């Protein structure tokens, strides 16, 4: 059973790392403008989430995914790839990545309450609070509705590879 | 999360009741709570798949009594596709929008799994006991016959979609001749 | 030296097949509307090109690519994937695929005039005429550009994979 | 829970098909000699096992693996690859494949008595009887002890790939 | 490199001239030069492939005249396989050794390329003219018919190898019925 | 042919002069003959790469003669990156548009090859002499130091981009401490 | 079953007492049952891994009191490897056979998993709190230092295996300087 | 044309590195025995070859293959995998790897005398001398003839990958 909770922490760590990196890229490109201060709050939120999941990963002696040096050049290329198209390539990347994160948080909180709902809640309340804080500002053009989907598909494939490898 | 999702199910089921003038948008989902929008379409597709399964089962438990005749695989597959497509008649004007939603590059796994399960539950009742590579070909050889046919029904204007059914003939015959 | 004049015929046949299939899809969706005849004319031109390259392939006894049953479900999915997003969503697919075809025709006529320009021209004039007829009507929205590139960058891996295999 | 009782039937069907093909090859090469009858008896045993698992797969409406057309040319190449090296192909390949089959039967009968041992035994007794009949005659040269291992490793990777995909 | 290969060719040929009592070893090569060893086998296979091509060509050039009736496809394939196999009659003693050598895990690419070229040159003179996925299936559907048949000729003892030829019939008919 | 491209080269070279008038659009390329646009940018980048190579070579031919001081690797890399970046000064206004064009999902191979060749020349003219896995790391460890630095120059407003150069220091030192 | 696995475990843990007299064969386990593919080597390796973990834990529970000094990382790693290797002293006669059996192409996954778990339990008690790519390098950077060292102990003859330990020094210092 | 004279230096460097590692392993296992000196002499020969090709690679500004950190754990495994089976790892692995090296040296010296035989021979004489010195002592058990083949096939696939990647 320890190898069942040994997968959710790794995937959450990897996803939060990717999101932090994306926001770092977008802040590096759109830094000194009228929209910079909006991305700073999200970047700080994600740094906080990453520190929490990092201490939680150090505690349970988890194994970090081996692909982490690859989300470091692909988490920054989608921070200058988008966000150079104006404030429509930025509003469409954060929404997509945060919807993907919330969807996977729901999928995790499903299979952890129907299998063993009492050997936990030192961790499950954390997942619930993180889902709430991640979906609070994910709610805030027929062509962008395809860019968002083709970003969500990538952010959903990169989670399925980071579980096993 | 048991006494709340069992009510979201009823929310969706009552919301998709009146969509002839409101579209699959995120407002007819809430306008139905008085009594993109991918979850609604996926729920409707799952429900129609389950009802097709149940109808085929009620029909299957009618030949063990000697009351209904037997048909070859041709007629049975034609009738199965026909009675599955005849559920899209009320929601025919706002269908292409939902079909677009179902084909976005991040909804393809779910829709493809639903299509595969439908094709499997449609082939299994037509006496298919095969454990080979033929388990795949036949399945695929039917999925096309479905998808293509759908892309005609949305643009047909003939009385009672008669034209469409004719196409089905000229698409299953050439299929059952090793096509 | 026969492999050089073999790979070109194989990849050209594969590309023309893919294009014919894409136009078949887009005609299957936008059939009875005000944009039918354009797709019909392009489909007829591509059927003509395919018949020409098919006889030219049968002559030289060359090997068709093994992936042909895969461009048959991926050449029709981009005929209902696009062309359901409206007219300006279908115009952005034909332009992309035809620009890719013309770019490869140029790249392919380059390495055949600098290596041996006299053992040929029973085939090179064909390539030149096809490039002209393919680029004549490829000339006839900040997001609809990105959606084009991600389609022009798929028809360049499907050509990298279809000549070797 | 149905996926658990599905995967095991799929693996068993694929493995018995592979073993049947290996014995068919070895019988095709060493047919009219002094070793024929042993291979014939083993081939009949494996045909019986295959018919049993085939009816069991037809009953539960399971999905046969997609790689089956690949074990048809790789299950016969190890019936002329070995068995042409003399009577030490009919004493290393068979031993290896039967030890692999018995090992996987043990591994399956382990994880089916510790998860749910009472919703079954209409199938578990079958697995036990098959393991006994497969290991009874698997017991009946420092270089051959490497060929046997390099065959067993392949017969394990094949089971893995055929169970997942 | 000209004289080197021009002498290697004659050496291998003169060696191959007499292997009825010496085997495909590194011994008959020198015994031929006086007048593992996989290069000899590969040279023999290449030469027999070339001669089969030439014989099929000489036979085809008698149809454009009007002196030879045009047989069906299955009959032509049976005759082609029989013609190609009747070259292994003198060397039938020590063939299983060469077949073992040809199947080691590091000679499979070369042998497979030779087999593919032989099957292609055998199908092309039968009027294939196919540019589809059927380019592959048919080829494969013939390679088996060859390989299996070979594995019978080495263990048959009937006069004129008659039994073997009968097998070919019962292996090509079941193939020409889409098998 | 030959004259066609040999004159199109001059067309592009003359067109990229008055880019501060219109921009990298398809308006200055054609109007340059009176004296999208995804080829003008690649031509400009290739030309500046070649000129950087030539300048590094003309400078290296001085230290192998005397009268030219030597300096450590970090100082030379800082000077090389500064020299290469001081070519984008007149075109600094309309650069981010060209940078967007260079990062579309179908221009990444070409741009990445150009960047790799630039970094390779910049390292080879610094005395690398490495045949190991370190051939890659170092290269990568510099590409970042370039790209990131560029993304500052387009948004800096300090006199003569002084601020930017300071960043380079605080980005190469951390690299020369095994970063 | 419980009794079956218990008796298997008892047979295995009692069998390896007379291995210094027969060797890692089926004969020794049969002799031990009184009171080929081994599985005995795997049982022995698992048991020694567990005992190493337990010993490191008992030692760690003595530094959080004040009786044991906290030495540096390299010294702790040298002491851990020496402690783990000093268990193979009585079985040093017949070890190369077991090391060969452990390296056959079908026992590599199990042996590699055991080695990885040992290296992890050896690094965790050294104070390594790293969630990065450095989680891998360090681990690998130790596995070598172990394996190579083993390949010396089986061929050394110096008293107290002193030479071997010296090697460890010249293999870990050279590693702690960014090896 | 520089890619042609580049893809040969890269392959030669990679292959000589692999052979050096194999001999290092076999010397690490069979060090203090009656066979040590032969492996020592071969190791010195291969170190000399590697130094030569290393200076030749530094001169022409070649790109070393990216898989080099992978032939460092797979070039030492087959120095403890074999050479632990007695004196049949030192007579079935060295022979195989040296025959593979000689075969590829022949294959290279073929396509470099028929394409341009006069812009060279500052490098071709080196290849010829290396082939002679590699084949001079490669000439110095029906089951030990399959291990050799299954090692030579791997040493050929490893050369198929070093050049392109």
Q: What is the 3-state secondary structure (H, E, C) of H69-107?
A: CCCCCCCCHHHCCCCCCCCCCCCCCHHHHHHHHHHHHHH
**CA–CA dist A53, A17 (Å, integer):** 10
> D25 in helix, strand or coil?
helix
D61 to chain H, closest Cα gap in Å = 41
- Secondary structure element (H or E) that encloses residue C94, with its range: helix C87-110
Q: Residue B135 corresponds to which tokens in the numbers above?
A: 């388990």
Quickly tell me which residue has 């019925």 as its tokens: E177
CA F35 to chain CA mean position, Å: 27
Q: Residue D8 corresponds to which tokens in the numbers above?
A: 């095991």
Q: Residue A25 corresponds to which tokens in the numbers above?
A: 């890229």
Q: Let me know how long chain C is.
A: 165
**CA–CA dist D19, D38 (Å, integer):** 15
> What DSSP line would sit under A97-127, residue for residue?
HHHHHHHHHHHHHHTTTSS-SSS-SSSHHHH
Resolution (A): 3.5
- Secondary structure element (H or E) that encloses residue C69, with its range: none
Q: Do E155 and D31 touch (CB under 8 A)?
A: yes
CATH number for the region D2-164 comes to 1.20.1260
- The angle at the Cα of F156, spanning F155 to F158, to the nearest 5 degrees, equals 160
CA C25 to chain CA mean position, Å: 14
Contact call for residues A124 and A112 (beta carbons, < 8 A):
yes
CA F14 to chain CA mean position, Å: 20
**CA–CA dist B176, B76 (Å, integer):** 12
From chain G, the residues in CB contact with H77 under 8 A are 103
Looking at chain F, which subunits does it touch, using at least 3 CB pairs closer than 8 Å as the criterion?
A: A, C, H
Using alpha carbons, select from C67, D115, F179 the residue that is nearest to residue E136: C67
End-to-end CA distance of chain B: 48
> What DSSP line would sit under chain F, residue for residue?
--HHHHHHHHHHHHHTSSTTTS-SSHHHHHHGGG---TTHHHHHHHHHHHHHHHHHHHHHHHHTTSSS----HHHHHHHHHHHHHTTSSTT-TTHHHHHHHTTSTTSHHHHHHHHHHHHHHHHHTT-----STHHHHHHHHHHHHHHHHHHHHTT--SGGGHHHHHHHHHHHHHHHTT-
CA dihedral angle for residue G77, residue G80, residue G82, residue G86, rounded to 10 degrees: -170
> D33 in helix, strand or coil?
coil
User: What is the residue extent of each domain of chain H?
Assistant: 2-164
Q: Do C80 and B151 touch (CB under 8 A)?
A: yes
Looking at chain A, which subunits does it touch, using at least 3 CB pairs closer than 8 Å as the criterion?
A: B, C, F, G
In this structure, what DSSP letter does residue E89 have?
A: S
Distance (Å) of CA F54 to CA F68, F84, F129: 17, 12, 20
**CA–CA dist H112, H5 (Å, integer):** 9
Q: Residue C162 corresponds to which tokens in the numbers above?
A: 């279809």
> G47 in helix, strand or coil?
helix
| CB < 8 Å from D in window 118-157 of E | 148, 151, 155
**CA–CA dist F14, F28 (Å, integer):** 10
**CA–CA dist E69, H48 (Å, integer):** 69
- The angle at the Cα of D69, spanning D66 to D74, to the nearest 5 degrees, equals 120
> E109 in helix, strand or coil?
helix
Whether chain A has a CB inside 8 Å of the CB on F103: the answer is: yes
CA dihedral angle for residue E16, residue E19, residue E22, residue E27, rounded to 10 degrees: -10
Q: Assess whether chains E and G touch, using the rule of 3 or more C-beta pairs within 8 angstroms.
A: no
Using alpha carbons, select from A155, A132, A156 the residue that is nearest to residue A74: A155
**CA–CA dist F60, F68 (Å, integer):** 9
Question: Which residue in the set A28, A31, A80 is minimally distant from F103, CB to CB?
Answer: A80
Q: Residue D165 corresponds to which tokens in the numbers above?
A: 């995909």
3 state SS for C138-160: CCCCCCCCHHHHHHHCCCCHHHH
**CA–CA dist E136, C65 (Å, integer):** 10
Contact call for residues H60 and H6 (beta carbons, < 8 A):
yes
Using alpha carbons, select from D36, D18, D24 the residue that is nearest to residue D79: D24
The strand ranges marked E within chain A are none
Q: Residue H75 corresponds to which tokens in the numbers above?
A: 């070039």
> What DSSP line would sit under D91-157, residue for residue?
TTHHHHHHHHHHHHHHHHHHTTTSS-SSS-SSSHHHHHHHHHHHHTTS----SHHHHHHHHHHHHHH
Contact call for residues D57 and D13 (beta carbons, < 8 A):
yes
> B88 in helix, strand or coil?
coil
Half-sphere exposure of C155 (CA within 13 A, CB side): 26
CA A99 to chain CA mean position, Å: 9
| CB < 8 Å from E in window 65-84 of D | 77, 80-81, 84
Q: Assess whether chains E and A touch, using the rule of 3 or more C-beta pairs within 8 angstroms.
A: no
CA H86 to chain CA mean position, Å: 23
**CA–CA dist C82, D95 (Å, integer):** 56
Quickly tell me which residue has 């298997």 as its tokens: G8
Which of G103, G139, G146, G167 would you mutate first to test chain H, the one with the most H CBs within 10 A? Answer: G103
In this structure, what DSSP letter does residue E125 have?
A: T
How buried is B69 (Cβ within 10 angstroms: 0-12 exposed, 13-18 middle, 19+ buried)?
Answer: exposed
Q: Do C54 and E131 touch (CB under 8 A)?
A: yes
Contact call for residues E107 and E99 (beta carbons, < 8 A):
no
Region at G24 (left for phi over 0; alpha for psi -120 to 50; beta for the rest): beta
**CA–CA dist A58, A52 (Å, integer):** 10
**CA–CA dist H56, D149 (Å, integer):** 41
**Phi and psi angles of residue C79, each rounded to the nearest 5 degrees, phi first:** -145, 0
Q: Residue A11 corresponds to which tokens in the numbers above?
A: 């995937």
Quickly tell me which residue has 């386990």 as its tokens: G29
Q: Classify the C-alpha dihedral H30-H32-H38-H43 as positive or negative.
A: positive
> What DSSP line would sit under chain H, residue for residue?
-HHHHHHHHHHHHHHHHHHHHHHHHHHHHS-SSSSHHHHHHHHHHHHHHHHHHHHHHHHTT----TTTTTTTTTTTGGGTSSSSSSTTSTTTTHHHHHHHHHHHHHHHHHTTTSS-SSS-SSSHHHHHHHHHHHHTTS----SHHHHHHHHHHHHHHHHHHHHH-
Q: Residue C152 corresponds to which tokens in the numbers above?
A: 């022009």
CA H115 to chain CA mean position, Å: 25
Neighbouring C-beta atoms of residue D49, cutoff 10 Å: 22
**Phi and psi angles of residue D63, each rounded to the nearest 5 degrees, phi first:** -105, 115
Contact call for residues D57 and B124 (beta carbons, < 8 A):
no
Contacts of F111 by beta carbon, 8 Å cutoff, 6+ apart: F42, F45, F102, F103
> What DSSP line would sit under B89-114, residue for residue?
STT-TTHHHHHHHTTSTTTHHHHHHH
Contacts of G21 by beta carbon, 8 Å cutoff, 6+ apart: G28
Quickly tell me which residue has 């090793």 as its tokens: B178
From chain G, the residues in CB contact with A61 under 8 A are 124
Quickly tell me which residue has 């005429």 as its tokens: C129
Q: Do G133 and A69 touch (CB under 8 A)?
A: yes
Distance (Å) of CA H102 to CA A12, B88, B103, D38, H157: 52, 70, 55, 44, 15
End-to-end CA distance of chain E: 48
Q: Classify the C-alpha dihedral E125-E128-E134-E137 as positive or negative.
A: negative
Q: Residue C72 corresponds to which tokens in the numbers above?
A: 């048959």
In this structure, what DSSP letter does residue B173 have?
A: H
Contact call for residues E24 and E94 (beta carbons, < 8 A):
yes
Q: Residue B120 corresponds to which tokens in the numbers above?
A: 């499997």
**CA–CA dist C26, C77 (Å, integer):** 9
Contact call for residues D96 and G104 (beta carbons, < 8 A):
no
**CA–CA dist E60, E68 (Å, integer):** 9
- The angle at the Cα of G12, spanning G10 to G15, to the nearest 5 degrees, equals 105
Contact call for residues D50 and D12 (beta carbons, < 8 A):
no
CA B92 to chain CA mean position, Å: 13
**CA–CA dist A92, G129 (Å, integer):** 37
Using alpha carbons, select from G102, G136, G142 the residue that is nearest to residue G119: G142
CA D161 to chain CA mean position, Å: 14
**CA–CA dist A135, A102 (Å, integer):** 6
- The angle at the Cα of E83, spanning E82 to E87, to the nearest 5 degrees, equals 105
Q: Assess whether chains A and H touch, using the rule of 3 or more C-beta pairs within 8 angstroms.
A: no
Quickly tell me which residue has 């944009």 as its tokens: C35
Distance (Å) of CA E120 to CA C63, C76, D39, E113, E127: 10, 32, 35, 10, 11
Largest CA distance in chain A: 50
**Phi and psi angles of residue B122, each rounded to the nearest 5 degrees, phi first:** -90, -35
Which of H14, H59, H68, H70 would you mutate first to test chain F, the one with the most F CBs within 10 A? Answer: H68
Q: Do F131 and H13 touch (CB under 8 A)?
A: yes
Contact call for residues H55 and H9 (beta carbons, < 8 A):
no
Q: Residue H26 corresponds to which tokens in the numbers above?
A: 């076999």
Q: Residue G70 corresponds to which tokens in the numbers above?
A: 């906290």
């Amino acid at each position: 059973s320890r190898a069942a909770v040994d997968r959710i922490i790794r995937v959450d760590h990897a996803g939060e790392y990717g999101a932090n990196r994306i926001y770092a890229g977008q802040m590096a490109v759109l830094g000194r403008t009228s929209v910079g201060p909006v991305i700073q709050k999200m970047w700080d939120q994600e740094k906080d989430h990453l520190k929490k999941f990092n201490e939680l990963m150090v505690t349970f002696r988890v194994r970090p995914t081996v692909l982490m040096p690859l989300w470091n050049v692909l988490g920054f290329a989608l921070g200058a790839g988008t966000a150079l198209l104006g404030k429509e390539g930025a509003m469409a990347c954060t929404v997509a990545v945060e919807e993907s994160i919330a969807h996977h948080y729901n999928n995790q909180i499903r299979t952890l309450m129907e299998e063993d709902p009492e050997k936990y809640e030192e961790l499950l309340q954390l997942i619930k609070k993180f889902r709430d804080e991640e979906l609070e500002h994910h709610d805030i053009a027929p062509a962008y509705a395809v860019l968002k989907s083709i970003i969500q598909a990538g952010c959903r494939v990169a989670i399925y590879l980071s579980e096993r490898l | 999360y048991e006494s709340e999702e069992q009510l979201q199910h009823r929310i969706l089921t009552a919301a998709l009741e009146f969509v002839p003038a409101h579209g699959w948008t995120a407002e007819a989902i809430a306008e139905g709570a008085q009594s993109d929008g991918s979850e609604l379409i996926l729920h409707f597709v799952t429900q129609c798949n389950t009802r097709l399964t149940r109808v085929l089962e009620e029909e299957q438990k009618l030949v063990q009594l000697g009351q209904a005749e037997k048909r070859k695989t041709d007629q049975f597959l034609r009738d199965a596709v026909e009675t599955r497509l005849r559920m899209l008649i009320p929601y025919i004007e706002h269908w292409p929008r939902a079909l677009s939603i179902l084909m976005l590059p991040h909804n393809i796994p779910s829709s493809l799994s639903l299509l595969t399960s439908m094709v499997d539950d449609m082939w299994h009742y037509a006496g298919d006991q095969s454990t080979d590579f033929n388990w795949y070909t036949r399945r695929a050889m039917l999925a096309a016959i479905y998808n293509t046919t759908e892309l005609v029904m949305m643009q047909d204007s003939s009385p009672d979609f008669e034209d469409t059914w004719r196409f089905l003939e000229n698409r299953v015959n050439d299929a059952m001749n090793m096509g």
